[PDB]
Amino acid sequence: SVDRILEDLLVRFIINCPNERELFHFEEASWFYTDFIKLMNPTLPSLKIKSFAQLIIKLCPLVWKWDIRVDEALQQFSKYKKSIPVRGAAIFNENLSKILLVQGTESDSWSFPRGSKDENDIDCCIREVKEEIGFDLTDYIDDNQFIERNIQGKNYKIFLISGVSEVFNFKPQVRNEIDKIEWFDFKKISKTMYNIKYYLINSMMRPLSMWLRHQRQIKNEDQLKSYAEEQLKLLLGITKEEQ
Protein backbone atom coordinates (compact mmCIF):
# COMPACT_ATOMS: atom_id res chain seq x y z
CA SER A 1 0.00 0.00 0.00
CA VAL A 2 0.79 3.81 -0.15
CA ASP A 3 1.34 3.87 3.68
CA ARG A 4 3.31 0.54 3.43
CA ILE A 5 5.95 2.52 1.45
CA LEU A 6 5.97 5.49 3.97
CA GLU A 7 6.44 2.79 6.68
CA ASP A 8 9.32 0.94 4.85
CA LEU A 9 10.97 4.35 4.17
CA LEU A 10 11.17 5.03 7.97
CA VAL A 11 12.29 1.38 8.53
CA ARG A 12 15.28 1.92 6.09
CA PHE A 13 16.23 5.57 6.97
CA ILE A 14 14.70 6.69 10.37
CA ILE A 15 15.61 3.29 12.01
CA ASN A 16 19.28 3.09 10.75
CA CYS A 17 19.85 6.26 12.92
CA PRO A 18 20.64 4.44 16.30
CA ASN A 19 23.40 4.17 17.42
CA GLU A 20 25.08 7.61 17.14
CA ARG A 21 22.22 15.02 11.94
CA GLU A 22 18.62 13.59 11.80
CA LEU A 23 17.83 16.48 9.41
CA PHE A 24 20.14 14.91 6.77
CA HIS A 25 18.58 11.47 7.36
CA PHE A 26 15.24 13.25 6.69
CA GLU A 27 16.59 14.93 3.49
CA GLU A 28 18.17 11.62 2.26
CA ALA A 29 14.87 9.72 2.79
CA SER A 30 13.00 12.53 0.95
CA TRP A 31 15.48 12.25 -1.94
CA PHE A 32 15.28 8.48 -2.09
CA TYR A 33 11.49 8.50 -2.40
CA THR A 34 11.67 11.64 -4.69
CA ASP A 35 14.18 10.24 -7.26
CA PHE A 36 12.96 6.55 -7.14
CA ILE A 37 9.29 6.21 -5.99
CA LYS A 38 8.34 9.08 -8.40
CA LEU A 39 9.50 7.20 -11.58
CA MET A 40 8.15 3.86 -10.29
CA ASN A 41 4.79 4.79 -8.60
CA PRO A 42 3.85 7.75 -10.91
CA THR A 43 0.43 8.26 -9.23
CA LEU A 44 1.91 9.14 -5.77
CA PRO A 45 2.30 12.78 -4.61
CA SER A 46 5.71 14.48 -4.80
CA LEU A 47 5.66 15.86 -1.24
CA LYS A 48 8.22 18.52 -0.27
CA ILE A 49 11.20 18.44 2.17
CA LYS A 50 9.22 20.17 5.04
CA SER A 51 5.93 18.31 4.28
CA PHE A 52 7.43 14.76 4.13
CA ALA A 53 9.43 15.69 7.29
CA GLN A 54 6.14 16.70 9.02
CA LEU A 55 4.31 13.59 7.65
CA ILE A 56 6.75 11.40 9.67
CA ILE A 57 6.35 13.54 12.87
CA LYS A 58 2.53 12.71 12.80
CA LEU A 59 2.95 8.92 12.12
CA CYS A 60 6.12 8.22 14.28
CA PRO A 61 5.96 10.98 16.96
CA LEU A 62 8.15 8.72 19.16
CA VAL A 63 11.24 9.29 16.94
CA TRP A 64 11.23 13.17 17.63
CA LYS A 65 13.37 13.99 20.74
CA TRP A 66 13.07 17.79 21.44
CA ASP A 67 10.24 20.41 21.76
CA ILE A 68 11.75 22.64 18.99
CA ARG A 69 9.50 23.36 15.94
CA VAL A 70 9.39 21.27 12.70
CA ASP A 71 9.61 24.29 10.31
CA GLU A 72 12.08 25.98 12.73
CA ALA A 73 14.39 22.94 12.55
CA LEU A 74 14.45 22.83 8.71
CA GLN A 75 15.32 26.59 8.83
CA GLN A 76 18.19 25.71 11.20
CA PHE A 77 19.46 22.88 8.91
CA SER A 78 19.51 25.15 5.82
CA LYS A 79 21.02 27.91 8.04
CA TYR A 80 23.97 25.60 8.92
CA LYS A 81 24.54 24.49 5.27
CA LYS A 82 24.35 28.18 4.02
CA SER A 83 27.99 28.42 2.81
CA ILE A 84 28.23 28.30 -1.06
CA PRO A 85 25.35 26.85 -3.13
CA VAL A 86 26.07 25.07 -6.47
CA ARG A 87 23.64 24.42 -9.39
CA GLY A 88 24.16 22.54 -12.65
CA ALA A 89 22.67 20.80 -15.69
CA ALA A 90 22.87 17.17 -16.92
CA ILE A 91 22.80 17.65 -20.74
CA PHE A 92 21.83 14.55 -22.82
CA ASN A 93 21.72 14.13 -26.62
CA GLU A 94 18.75 13.78 -29.04
CA ASN A 95 18.77 9.93 -29.00
CA LEU A 96 19.19 9.75 -25.17
CA SER A 97 22.50 7.76 -25.59
CA LYS A 98 25.26 10.18 -24.42
CA ILE A 99 25.60 12.90 -21.70
CA LEU A 100 27.78 16.02 -22.28
CA LEU A 101 30.49 16.33 -19.56
CA VAL A 102 33.15 18.87 -18.68
CA GLN A 103 36.59 18.48 -17.18
CA GLY A 104 38.16 21.30 -15.26
CA THR A 105 41.39 23.19 -15.73
CA GLU A 106 42.68 22.07 -12.28
CA SER A 107 41.09 18.63 -11.92
CA ASP A 108 40.91 15.66 -14.29
CA SER A 109 37.49 14.57 -12.85
CA TRP A 110 34.48 14.74 -15.20
CA SER A 111 31.37 16.55 -13.73
CA PHE A 112 28.17 18.14 -15.15
CA PRO A 113 28.55 21.91 -16.04
CA ARG A 114 28.08 23.65 -12.64
CA GLY A 115 28.54 26.89 -10.64
CA SER A 116 24.82 34.87 -8.13
CA LYS A 117 24.10 37.53 -5.43
CA ASP A 118 20.42 38.07 -6.49
CA GLU A 119 19.55 35.71 -9.45
CA ASN A 120 17.66 32.42 -8.91
CA ASP A 121 18.78 28.74 -9.42
CA ILE A 122 17.57 28.61 -13.08
CA ASP A 123 19.38 31.85 -14.00
CA CYS A 124 22.53 30.45 -12.35
CA CYS A 125 22.33 27.24 -14.40
CA ILE A 126 21.56 29.12 -17.68
CA ARG A 127 24.51 31.53 -17.05
CA GLU A 128 27.01 28.83 -15.96
CA VAL A 129 26.22 26.56 -18.96
CA LYS A 130 26.49 29.62 -21.32
CA GLU A 131 29.91 30.42 -19.73
CA GLU A 132 31.40 26.85 -19.78
CA ILE A 133 29.86 25.32 -22.99
CA GLY A 134 28.58 28.21 -25.18
CA PHE A 135 25.07 26.84 -25.58
CA ASP A 136 22.49 29.16 -24.01
CA LEU A 137 20.26 26.47 -22.45
CA THR A 138 17.30 28.99 -22.03
CA ASP A 139 15.09 27.13 -24.60
CA TYR A 140 15.63 23.65 -23.13
CA ILE A 141 15.35 24.21 -19.29
CA ASP A 142 12.47 22.43 -17.48
CA ASP A 143 12.03 23.81 -13.98
CA ASN A 144 10.20 20.74 -12.54
CA GLN A 145 13.01 18.10 -13.06
CA PHE A 146 16.26 17.98 -11.00
CA ILE A 147 18.31 15.90 -8.54
CA GLU A 148 19.77 17.26 -5.28
CA ARG A 149 22.65 16.21 -2.92
CA ASN A 150 24.79 18.29 -0.45
CA ILE A 151 28.53 17.49 -0.67
CA GLN A 152 30.46 18.53 2.51
CA GLY A 153 28.50 21.79 2.90
CA LYS A 154 28.01 22.84 -0.77
CA ASN A 155 24.53 21.98 -2.07
CA TYR A 156 24.40 20.50 -5.58
CA LYS A 157 21.12 20.94 -7.54
CA ILE A 158 21.38 19.42 -11.07
CA PHE A 159 18.72 20.09 -13.74
CA LEU A 160 17.88 17.52 -16.40
CA ILE A 161 17.97 18.29 -20.18
CA SER A 162 17.61 16.02 -23.27
CA GLY A 163 17.45 16.35 -27.07
CA VAL A 164 20.66 18.38 -27.38
CA SER A 165 22.58 18.19 -30.72
CA GLU A 166 25.71 15.95 -30.95
CA VAL A 167 26.85 17.89 -34.14
CA PHE A 168 27.00 21.27 -32.21
CA ASN A 169 30.42 22.96 -32.05
CA PHE A 170 30.63 23.67 -28.28
CA LYS A 171 33.38 26.09 -27.16
CA PRO A 172 33.94 27.68 -23.72
CA GLN A 173 33.27 31.41 -23.07
CA VAL A 174 35.68 31.17 -20.09
CA ARG A 175 38.80 29.59 -21.85
CA ASN A 176 40.97 28.78 -18.82
CA GLU A 177 38.22 27.43 -16.58
CA ILE A 178 37.00 24.47 -18.67
CA ASP A 179 39.79 22.45 -20.13
CA LYS A 180 37.69 19.83 -21.96
CA ILE A 181 34.02 19.15 -23.06
CA GLU A 182 33.11 15.60 -24.37
CA TRP A 183 30.05 13.41 -24.98
CA PHE A 184 30.02 10.18 -22.91
CA ASP A 185 28.00 7.10 -23.99
CA PHE A 186 25.70 6.60 -20.92
CA LYS A 187 25.79 2.78 -21.00
CA LYS A 188 29.64 2.95 -20.95
CA ILE A 189 29.85 5.36 -17.93
CA SER A 190 27.73 2.90 -15.91
CA LYS A 191 30.12 0.01 -16.85
CA THR A 192 33.35 2.03 -16.40
CA MET A 193 32.17 3.49 -13.00
CA TYR A 194 34.29 1.16 -10.79
CA ASN A 195 40.22 4.31 -14.41
CA ILE A 196 38.33 7.53 -15.55
CA LYS A 197 37.51 10.16 -12.87
CA TYR A 198 33.79 11.17 -12.50
CA TYR A 199 32.69 13.73 -9.84
CA LEU A 200 28.97 14.27 -9.24
CA ILE A 201 27.60 11.89 -11.91
CA ASN A 202 28.66 8.84 -9.84
CA SER A 203 26.33 9.81 -6.92
CA MET A 204 23.34 9.92 -9.33
CA MET A 205 23.94 7.13 -11.78
CA ARG A 206 20.66 5.41 -10.79
CA PRO A 207 18.29 8.49 -10.86
CA LEU A 208 19.89 9.72 -14.12
CA SER A 209 19.32 6.25 -15.67
CA MET A 210 15.69 6.05 -14.45
CA TRP A 211 14.97 9.56 -15.77
CA LEU A 212 16.46 8.58 -19.19
CA ARG A 213 13.99 5.63 -19.34
CA HIS A 214 11.13 7.97 -18.35
CA GLN A 215 12.20 10.51 -21.02
CA ARG A 216 12.26 7.69 -23.61
CA GLN A 217 8.78 6.21 -22.95
CA ILE A 218 7.49 9.81 -23.05
CA LYS A 219 9.33 10.40 -26.42
CA ASN A 220 8.37 7.03 -28.09
CA GLU A 221 4.68 7.55 -27.16
CA ASP A 222 4.75 11.32 -28.07
CA GLN A 223 5.72 10.08 -31.57
CA LEU A 224 2.62 7.79 -31.71
CA LYS A 225 0.51 10.82 -30.59
CA SER A 226 1.87 12.87 -33.56
CA TYR A 227 1.33 9.81 -35.81
CA ALA A 228 -2.34 9.44 -34.70
CA GLU A 229 -2.81 13.28 -34.80
CA GLU A 230 -2.01 13.02 -38.54
CA GLN A 231 -3.54 9.53 -39.19
CA LEU A 232 -6.86 10.80 -37.77
CA LYS A 233 -6.79 14.21 -39.60
CA LEU A 234 -6.08 12.50 -42.99
CA LEU A 235 -9.45 10.58 -42.55
CA LEU A 236 -11.66 12.76 -40.26
CA GLY A 237 -13.02 14.59 -43.37
CA ILE A 238 -13.25 18.42 -43.45
CA THR A 239 -9.93 19.27 -41.63
CA LYS A 240 -7.81 22.36 -42.62
CA GLU A 241 -7.31 26.09 -41.59
CA GLU A 242 -10.00 28.69 -42.61
CA GLN A 243 -10.04 31.05 -39.50
Partner: peptide, 18 residues
Protein backbone atom coordinates in the same frame (compact mmCIF):
# COMPACT_ATOMS: atom_id res chain seq x y z
CA UNK B 1 9.36 -0.46 24.09
CA UNK B 2 10.67 1.05 20.76
CA UNK B 3 13.58 -1.43 20.62
CA UNK B 4 11.15 -4.36 21.03
CA UNK B 5 8.29 -3.13 18.81
CA UNK B 6 10.93 -2.47 16.08
CA UNK B 7 11.67 -6.24 16.16
CA UNK B 8 7.98 -6.84 15.18
CA UNK B 9 7.33 -4.02 12.66
CA UNK B 10 10.49 -4.39 10.39
CA UNK B 11 9.57 -8.11 9.95
CA UNK B 12 6.44 -7.15 7.88
CA UNK B 13 8.76 -5.48 5.31
CA UNK B 14 11.57 -8.13 4.84
CA UNK B 15 9.05 -11.02 4.65
CA UNK B 16 6.94 -9.14 2.05
CA UNK B 17 9.68 -7.67 -0.23
CA UNK B 18 11.98 -10.68 -0.91
Amino acid sequence: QLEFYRKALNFNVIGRYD
